Amino acid sequence: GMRRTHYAGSLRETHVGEEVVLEGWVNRRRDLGGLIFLDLRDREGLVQLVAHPASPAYATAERVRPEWVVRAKGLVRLRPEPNPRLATGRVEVELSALEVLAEAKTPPFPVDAGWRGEEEKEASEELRLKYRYLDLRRRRMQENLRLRHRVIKAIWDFLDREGFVQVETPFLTKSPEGARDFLVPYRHEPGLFYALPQSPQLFKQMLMVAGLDRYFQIARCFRDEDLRADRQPDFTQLDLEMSFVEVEDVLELNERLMAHVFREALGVELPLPFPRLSYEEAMERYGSDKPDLRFGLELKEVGPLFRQSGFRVFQEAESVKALALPKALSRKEVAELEEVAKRHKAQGLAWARVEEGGFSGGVAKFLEPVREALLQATEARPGDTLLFVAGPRKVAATALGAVRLRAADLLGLKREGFRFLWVVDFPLLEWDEEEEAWTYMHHPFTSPHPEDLPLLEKDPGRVRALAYDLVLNGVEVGGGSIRIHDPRLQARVFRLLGIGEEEQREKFGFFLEALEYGAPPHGGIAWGLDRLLALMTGSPSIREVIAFPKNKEGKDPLTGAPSPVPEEQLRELGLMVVRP
Amino acid sequence: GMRRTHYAGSLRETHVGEEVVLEGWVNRRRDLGGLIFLDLRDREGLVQLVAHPASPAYATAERVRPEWVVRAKGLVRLRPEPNPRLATGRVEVELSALEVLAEAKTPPFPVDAGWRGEEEKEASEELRLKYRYLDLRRRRMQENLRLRHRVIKAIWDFLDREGFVQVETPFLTKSTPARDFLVPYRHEPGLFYALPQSPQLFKQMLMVAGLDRYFQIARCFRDEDLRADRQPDFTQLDLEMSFVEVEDVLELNERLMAHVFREALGVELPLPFPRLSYEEAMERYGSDKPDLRFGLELKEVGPLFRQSGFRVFQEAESVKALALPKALSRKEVAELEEVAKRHKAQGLAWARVEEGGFSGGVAKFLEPVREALLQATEARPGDTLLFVAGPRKVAATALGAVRLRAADLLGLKREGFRFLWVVDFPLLEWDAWTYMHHPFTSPHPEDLPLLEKDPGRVRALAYDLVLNGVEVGGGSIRIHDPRLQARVFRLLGIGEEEQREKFGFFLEALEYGAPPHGGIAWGLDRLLALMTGSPSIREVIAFPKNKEGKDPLTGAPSPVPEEQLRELGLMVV
Ligand SMILES: Nc1cc(CO)cc2ncn([C@@H]3O[C@H](COS(=O)(=O)NC(=O)[C@@H](N)CC(=O)O)[C@@H](O)[C@H]3O)c12
Ligand SMILES: Nc1cc(CO)cc2ncn([C@@H]3O[C@H](COS(=O)(=O)NC(=O)[C@@H](N)CC(=O)O)[C@@H](O)[C@H]3O)c12
């Protein structure tokens, strides 16, 4: 069997008197009074080795330096003075033998602090990525990756128990998730390309057409996007699909799945069911289709109060949203929120102060005429600051919702735990204020609400969709919808999305024919697995929960990718670089 | 909650008297004696629905057609006579309601027979692939895909219990000089990612990172000849371990495989697996992937003919002998001889075995050494002796292929699953010298001094897992000493510029303390095809490419608009 008898970091007082064999890295060396103290590291933690001058292991111990790999044998004994910061802190290993398995030169950054329970100084991420195999020696990085393992294993356990069949779908396929495709040239016939999948969407629907009933996959998705916050050229999804389901069925199974993951992987109980809010209700109360429920400060609509007002900018406005903050902001803080507000298309930010009887500051003059009804609607108290955005309903909500989020940081609010919610009843379409056009909120295979089918021709903008987003602490972690299983309706919805018979046959012909052979009702969802794991670990970037990620430009400094290729290899594909 | 109360195919006698709601596809319709019989299908199997003339669903049941999607409601009843070919064979559902959820065109091929337990006529695979979503309705295809699920889940359960960490590795990586599938980098035309040939370097770096043991259901991409039932991308079970010897890797993979077969197939694999050195396998079977489902081992008999007048035997480097337990026809022998010649042999000698002597071909030259030849081959009266004389590797390889062909001719029973390890492969082979698998494969430590003196005799710490004459897995212990790795490169004539070009980043990683480590990769698609008795891995892949590497279902690979390609800064030559 293995020479190793225990993991180094797993030794305890119960092992005293036992002879052990250990293998690991030298976390640090310290010589004192002729003794050589070596902190031996493996994935379970640190344990102290002691090399005594009279021991055969001493000569070898004198050569050892940090990050050397060694095999150690000796007796477990109590330390005269225990180190309470270590799980092995009460014991040490009196060495009888020591062998060097590998030498190592000094690393470009330290990996030893985390294993001692000490704080780790910040290191250049570009350098960490260049030496990612060393960065992954740190305790925090291994904790993240082992959490990722526990999460995926819990997903397998739960969904296998629920009858879901894991199916692996192709990576070399044809060119719809609303992004740019990554292409793979077909060598035997230039001009032909595969496309890496933006998602397994159409394959998992065809698996429902095939009668598998319910499917899941830890699928890798590839999307070539530009301006994206914390973008990676590829990412991981928990993808799943179900047949003969309504919206409620997909939601019910997912929250039960999420509760199982958090319980088994984090030991956290998630109260069930998750809170549910419609798209309209979420925008009105929070000005965001991904509300952050870790605090209050809800938005109140104050439009019907200004229909008799001399303030033309309020009285004419479609919407005036107000927010009461429990603090008297400085003009700098107000100006900070005003800049945030203006960045979201608002006409401006109004401000004031709530005082014992009247109002003071900002637009306080215009606040004085109204009060009995207004104070009841906002519950504002002396010492508060009132902020207002007036405008179109969607603008007014979205601008003051971003102000709401920014103000939570300025005020230093304690935002704790994990607050999930479902956002449901999305409109089938979203108005592009920029391009003055209709665009879909979820992919074009989403089912419109069946009660609204006649509105497809009459009034497109009123059509609801059977779509849903899963939100965690103000972040979209998942999204899905009930699909269209009737071929007539799917073409209808394509013609409505500016797609004629030509683009349909070329881009989706195979799938539309599949719907003609008896497709069942079905729907599903996809999680952003990297995103969810980043939130579960309090990481600021998904790069902290991916083993070998790219940097912000989509480059790999460790391997040198992307890189050029020989002219010969490029001619073989029948392609050349366009000369500028 | 859900509308359906049960899976259609899950109903048994225990459900009699219950009112059920079922949803599925119309497998078949029969009108008999005024009753309308509908076979309702879902993934769990068929159940018989019965519409009676008095039932509100009578008219509906009459107009439905095969593959229509329907929701049925009714009372579970015993059949008057059970149909034991259905798991639901004892019961039926008296229809009170029938609702059409989707009509369906006539499929281009049938998908109903297998669900009744009937043989299915072979259909054009191109047609099956073009309508794969219909092909996957067949029972056989759903059983394959669900076995694949149970196998992967069993791998997760076992390796998680043994302390392995699943780690996902990049799909967009560095192109290096097999041919790489490339991915253009939009922001700088002329730069490309590559899809990974394997996770090798990444999993070795995870050992350098101290994770100790890793695994991954990894996808590999290799743009090479697709003949021999190859796909552009395929699935490996890939794992790596630290502080291990060859023994440790084999032992864990044996127990893992036994667990997979037990949980996924209900089959018990005796442990430990047999082991043969590469040399023993070639000597006894003429192949580095022996098929242990039958005997017929090869025997070296060259040293019996050193004083024999028969030139071709006497002067041959090696004479391999094979005893078939049947007297062959003059035709069969010529088929085996043609097989031998097809494998570089000079020919195939033969002779029939009698009670007191020989008779057939070289029988005359065998009588002088009769006693020794029978103790060596254990041949008996009625057998047929076959011989190939020539170079050791040629004679073994040729008669080993004859051995396999003879198994078919004799109609031998080849049943079950026979695993074995092939170990102690040579580290190098002639061309100057070259490696036999990967330049990171560790030499056998007790052969290290031979690395420069006699390279051809250096054993490697490599191993192949073979199932019924098919390689299903392979791996090795890796080099963790950069000084030894440089020593191997010097022996191979691989200069520094070439090392940095191919392995620079990983060679530098060895300088930071790499532990002893090793691993293996299974050909998961190949294994599943063998576990299901399928002739091609296409049968165990949901949406595979055809034999030519193209996807008839979607039409990929297909052209793109010139503006989609212009945006990447590339143009067709
Ligand atoms: N996390 C993450 C990172 C990056 C790096 O640049 C890009 C991402 N692009 C997406 N995600 C995450 O995947 C989730 C689902 O993807 S989806 O496009 O919304 N919907 C679909 O794909 C539908 N086919 C699902 C269905 O309808 O069943 C999002 O909620 C994000 O958490 C990304
Ligand atoms: N099944 C299968 C199908 C196809 C369709 O085109 C192509 C294949 N190419 C390979 N395989 C299967 O993968 C196994 C391991 O792959 S390897 O190249 O030998 N070694 C390695 O890749 C090392 N990284 C492993 C290590 O040393 O740890 C083989 O034993 C085959 O069963 C293929």
Numbering used by the authors:
A (entry chain B): 0 to 174, 176 to 580
B (entry chain A): 0 to 176, 179 to 432, 437 to 578
Show sentences the authors wrote.
For class II aaRSs, the adenine makes numerous interactions with active site residues, with the N1, N3 and N6 all making H-bond interactions with conserved features shared amongst all class II aaRS members. The interaction between the N3 of adenine with the conserved water molecule for class II aaRS enzymes is crucial for the recognition of aaSAs by the corresponding enzymes. It was hypothesized that the flipped exocyclic amine moiety of HMDDA should be able to mimic this specific interaction. Furthermore, the N6 amine group creates an unfavorable bond with the class II conserved structured water. This could explain the more significant decrease in inhibitory activity compared with that seen for class I aaRSs. However, in class II aaRSs, two different base conformations were observed, where the base adopts an anti-conformation in AspRS as seen in class I aaRSs but a syn conformation in SerRS. In the holo-enzyme of AspRS, the motif-2 loop region adopts an open conformation and only changes to the closed conformation upon the binding of adenine-containing compounds. Both HMDDA base conformations in SerRS and AspRS either lose the additional conserved structural water-mediated H-bonds as observed for the N3 of adenine or make unfavorable interactions with structured water due to the presence of protons at the N6-amine moiety. This contrasts with the inhibitory activity noted for the congeners targeting class II AspRS and SerRS, as only 9% and 54% inhibitory activity, respectively, was observed at a 200 µM inhibitor concentration.
The aminoacyl-tRNA synthetases (aaRSs) are essential enzymes playing a central role in the translation of the genetic code and hence constitute a viable target for the development of antibiotics. Both classes activate an amino acid in forming the respective aminoacyl-adenylate (aa-AMP) as natural reaction intermediates.
